[PDB]
Symmetry: C4
Subunit: 389 residues, 4 copies
């Protein structure tokens, strides 16, 4: 086998509903299954297989370890996976490493797995290549060293990963690691609007550029937007200019006054956002998702824009379809690409969290939408799960 | 590996009982298993593996999602599979795509998976090649776009698939899609008796011709019969002329007066029917199955006729044996072929539904009969399942 | 790959305890497993894998299908397997075909599976090669056509199988089938003491000869003994002359007066018996097993004799060790050979039935003994199962 | 494939927390899983896979066979394994052989499995290569013949294994077996301090030498230390001279007066200890672990020393980090190495026993620490398990 590279996307002009992974449809008291309790799911694909990753709390439904499953970080949390299409139960899953923050990617020869754990003030990112633990990176701002909760991206054997460190309420200046065969060979320090960047959802816009739509959890409801040049290994960050603000919470569309760079209102709090590239011969599409509600983690709409510069274009994003109605939960969302025989298929996945508060279990389903055929997006996704059962 | 083609059937002159997949033998309250709730099962084989497909309601027995499992279409419904011989439980199965109507087939190099979902008045057929979503086809009569519920058929890398759209009570004019490596490369519009055609059970009569025995759900208890020329890509449809009417409901054998084309009575309602080819050097056998009861979905008898033209032959089909007694359920039935080292083995499968009404669960066992050796068919199949447990 | 042949056995002069498969250690009300209800287990090995087969009643423990699990034949009974070392549960097992009498063997390229079902007066043997059903054999005495309940034996791609038909109380004259790539290419009619032969436990004494230790269920507690010449395809049967009578029930050792051919007393009833070959350069060992009790299916001792002719040798078999104490159940026993890199390892397996009558479940564990190292046999086997749980 | 040899360790200067296998997180009454009840876990890796071994009592939680799970040897005990990362449940595991003492190792081509069973006064070590049972070794002091409870060590196809036999309270003079493709080709009798040696944790210090840190269960809290020359096949044993005594129980560090060879106090009782090598170009690191408590099986600290001779160096071992706090259980510990593409990764594993006395179940989790990156060891491990559930 050989190193992989991004290719032209497969033909298409609309996303459709592809596949639901709702493990908790089998978690009843009256049933006989063991779906794992998770959050922060995401998908990453190699040349033959797509794997479905998540961060488990090392407990199952039904069970007696529900207390603490709404928490973010503890000493039991682990990165797990199954082959996409399999239900992530106790027996089906594989446990990769301890982690309360994760990522993964295939370089064409082998899987790289990324997981952060350790204490608040001095967390530690850990890298695993196939079966071997190979390297680490240390906390540099001593406040919850952190990573993407989605697929890293490899080209020509060089995989690029976003990390961040700092206060969830204040400054969190992100970096990028460049990783080869499980080992870190360069640190990349972005320039520009670097005040606060988290949980970048990243992909290839071409053989030369990686772009990421990220989260600012303090200052703005506009998404920070990264452009990484992989030939010179330099990165730059500015806010997205569109009036279709992609974060949650957010104010009404277009109501932030000033030029592209203004923050301005309802900027504290946030959500991880979906983002994927459609690469055509002489054109590029950018697909994004955002909650249906402006304040709450409910619903998910798909949006799209062809060409232009997301840093300077104030034009509204075209609303493509409703993937999750307002009456269903829409939490984190992410992008990934499936590898067809001669082309790549852009997809958006959506974490659909079963939230009933800290007094019962806390987990999530995963809905998948991909570019397929022509026309308009046709159907939405429900989890089907009743949390009383 | 290479493209596959239909070959000469293996030696034999009778079918026998081969294998039972009864997953609900393990769904007791007192047991510890998780068989999936399903309907519309079917089998499709490649050069090394046979896969057992079905449409699940994304629920398991025992469990608490029984409400709605008698319904036909919803947002949870999925195409799933196991390796034939494995019990399709939560953990054993793989989820391919969302769908409330399906099909699948191997072309010699890779699996093609077909699934239709979306709303009543604008459903959408979706195609997946290996792991990649690759193409779609749109509803053309805006009333439940629909497919075979059985194996498509691939020759020289070209796979052929029946679809239909229209009123289940009126006109539903079917088409055929020609699919290559996951993408549609021709639409085929049949000529002749096209008034109403559904759920074609299709196979190769030779390297030149695919034939299908289908369902008219409005007009007649004679099965519509398709002949598709795969060299010119043309298709023709006329009613089966035999006095052994294969649908359910149906009137007494031979009691429809007039020539081969007459409808005539008890034509509204219907069932998907089994049909498979036995290809010999200078002879062709056509095997078919039909319920034992004329009105009800009870029992299944196997029938056979050698040579002739099913469009013009009014001769009765030879009753070969009882596969399911009048006291066991006989719902959908289908054909498929297993690939031995140098020849193909024709088989008929039978969906045996556990029906207790809308107030409890609704699923199915699957019984398999295949051509093996000489003599007469010897034993019937029971599910063994008591629905109270 | 290539056709396999028997080779010289690996070095050793004693059997030891190898491995226990006790699936019912996990069938408590208070546990969360699904071991399959079975009887008639046996083991067969190819060049890379050993499979553990059994005849299931298509029910599990705990469950609500216990009624009928003491019965011998019904419509739900199936040949199943797992890779030796795995617990045969609902999910772990694979269902090969319907059968209430079975056998299997690998020819070096592929697995042949054998299963009989059908009605009492007209049962039917069925053959499957890999995934394909390929041939049948018909009942010839119209009274429970029947097979080995252990491994067939393949040489140079030709596999040899014992069958029988007739009254369990009267005449049952056995035959042998010669099978090649799933198809029957010769019937072999044995000569000599053919009055009554069942459930032969067969193996290679060399590239030229297969020998089998069988069961006479009517006339005698001496085991019938088959010598099949595989070059000329001829078979002969005489009673075993040893005073160490291998059947159950049996009279005291040596107490049957007359020459080698006398029946004489306590001959009605019987059991399947273990038997395997140890092939050395200029010597041959014959290993056998028999219950510890003379009347009852309790215990199992291992016995051995080097060279001679089992038809004419009245010398006592040397008692090698106790594999199952008198306080543990000892039902069917069988032989098989494991394939090490350059030599074959003889083994004896023992069905260890959990019998509590017709009012509760009925299944079995499987204990395995193999030739390994030097000295004497050291330890016995218990199932560990309490049937009340 | 080819024979494997030890290589240079991967780059790094500190261990970190890698992975937790806590199967009993899923053993609640309220849950639906079946983790196996085990003790004496260990890990061993080949060129593509790491397998997680243990000795089971052939019982699961929840279940009704808890009585006897605190015992050390019985007739049900078995060597089992899963792929490292999988939860060892009933279905996931594979049963290798009957054993109440074990070991295993890969030689580059195939897996060797070692298991001891049999009675107290005449136990028997059994060897299995891939699927075949191949050899045995007999008890030589007639008191619980015994082995490592950790990975054996293979070079150029020759695998080396420690065994012992004798009184747990008196003399137990260990030997080493040299094993090739499943068969013993040399016995090696160590010279020097041979009074009492058990459960050696062994690894390669180079292509020439194997070193083992072992357990004296009678005489001393200093660990006996073995040096095996694999070119001459000779072995020597002397006590570790360090003032950082690695056994439990043990007296205060440094308080055993006299030269390197003195016993002296609190020597009766003991524990199996972690030990692994870090092989660099011109330097060697020795990593070790020991309980946090001096008297009890609580906690586990990691210690390190570079170069010197452990037989004569009285210098204190450098304390590297706390792997398990004093409030968590710290039982057996062991070394292994994962194979990266071009270098080997040293790791320590820790058995973390759920002990609630003889009146309830007795089993263990497994925590894994590996050499990765630079800095200091950052986080500890908890099992998460409440034994009341
Ligand atoms: C405090 C920093 C947060 C990111 C802005 C926080 N991430 C971590 C690593 O703790 C996320 C946030 O608190 C939760 C959310 O917003 O859903 C998930 C949570 N993410 C994870 N538990 N992996
Ligand atoms: C309304 C059109 C019907 C076919 C004639 C209908 N098909 C769909 C796609 O809904 C079938 C029919 O109503 C049910 C049956 O007859 O068993 C099954 C049902 N089939 C499926 N649920 N796939
Ligand atoms: C009546 C003929 C018997 C052989 C002598 C009988 N075999 C069959 C196929 O029914 C066996 C016998 O009755 C039972 C036993 O002896 O344990 C098992 C039983 N064997 C199986 N159920 N496969
Ligand atoms: C009597 C000899 C002991 C070794 C010093 C004893 N070993 C055996 C093989 O029984 C160990 C010891 O008693 C128990 C322990 O210390 O944890 C485990 C126990 N080890 C195992 N059950 N494998
Ligand atoms: C990127 O590079 C490789 C050649 O190195 C090429 O085959 C591929 O088509 C390129 N990708 C795109 C999107 O053009
Ligand atoms: C169909 O075509 C191929 C050659 O292209 C041939 O090998 C095969 O035998 C043909 N099928 C039949 C049924 O004759
Ligand atoms: C049987 O035949 C093959 C050669 O055809 C040979 O390799 C093998 O050693 C022979 N078996 C015995 C037991 O001698
Ligand atoms: C040991 O031997 C092989 C060559 O036989 C070599 O490739 C390897 O590097 C050696 N190991 C060490 C630790 O130097
Ligand atoms: Ca924000
Ligand atoms: Ca009709
Ligand atoms: Ca008898
Ligand atoms: Ca000690
Ligand atoms: Y399972």
């Amino acid at each position: 086998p050989e190193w992989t590279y991004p290719r032209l996307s497969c033909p298409g002009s609309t996303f459709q509903k592809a596949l639901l992974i709702s493990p908790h449809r089998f978690g009843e008291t009256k049933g006989n299954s063991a779906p794992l309790i998770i959050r922060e799911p995401f998908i990453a694909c190699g040349p033959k297989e797509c794997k479905h990753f998540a961060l488990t709390h090392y407990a199952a439904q039904p069970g007696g370890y529900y207390n603490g499953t709404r928490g973010d970080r503890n000493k039991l949390r682990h990165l797990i996976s199954v082959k996409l299409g399999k239900i992530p139960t106790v027996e089906n899953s594989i446990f990769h490493m301890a982690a309360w923050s994760g990522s993964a990617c295939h370089d064409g020869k082998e899987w790289t797995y990324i997981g952060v754990d350790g204490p608040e003030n001095n967390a530690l990112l850990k890298i695993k290549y196939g079966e071997a633990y190979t390297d680490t990176y240390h906390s540099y701002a001593n406040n919850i060293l952190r990573t993407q909760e989605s697929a890293c991206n490899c080209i020509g054997g060089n995989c690029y990963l976003m990390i961040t460190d700092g206060s969830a309420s204040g400054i969190s200046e992100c970096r990028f690691l460049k990783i080869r065969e499980g080992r870190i060979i360069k640190e990349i320090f972005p320039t520009g609007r670097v005040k606060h960047t988290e949980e970048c959802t990243c992909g290839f816009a071409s053989n030369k550029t990686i772009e990421c739509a990220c989260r600012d959890n303090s200052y703005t409801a506009k998404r920070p937007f990264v452009k990484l040049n992989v030939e010179t290994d330099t990165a730059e960050i500015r806010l997205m200019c569109t009036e279709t603000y992609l974060d949650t919470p957010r104010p009404d569309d277009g109501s932030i006054t000033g030029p592209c760079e203004s923050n301005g209102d309802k900027g504290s709090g946030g959500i991880k956002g979906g983002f994927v590239h459609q690469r055509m011969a002489s054109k590029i599409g950018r697909w994004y998702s955002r909650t249906m509600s402006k304040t709450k983690r409910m619903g998910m709409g798909l949006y799209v824009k062809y060409d232009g510069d997301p840093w300077t274009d104030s034009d509204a994003l075209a609303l493509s379809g409703v993937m999750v109605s307002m009456e269903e939960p829409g939490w984190y969302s992410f992008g990934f690409e499936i590898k067809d025989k001669k082309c790549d298929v852009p997809c958006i996945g959506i974490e659909m969290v079963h939230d009933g508060g800290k007094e019962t279990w806390h987990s999530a389903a995963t809905a998948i939408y991909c570019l397929m055929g022509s026309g308009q997006l046709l159907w939405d996704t429900v989890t089907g799960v009743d949390m009383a059962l």
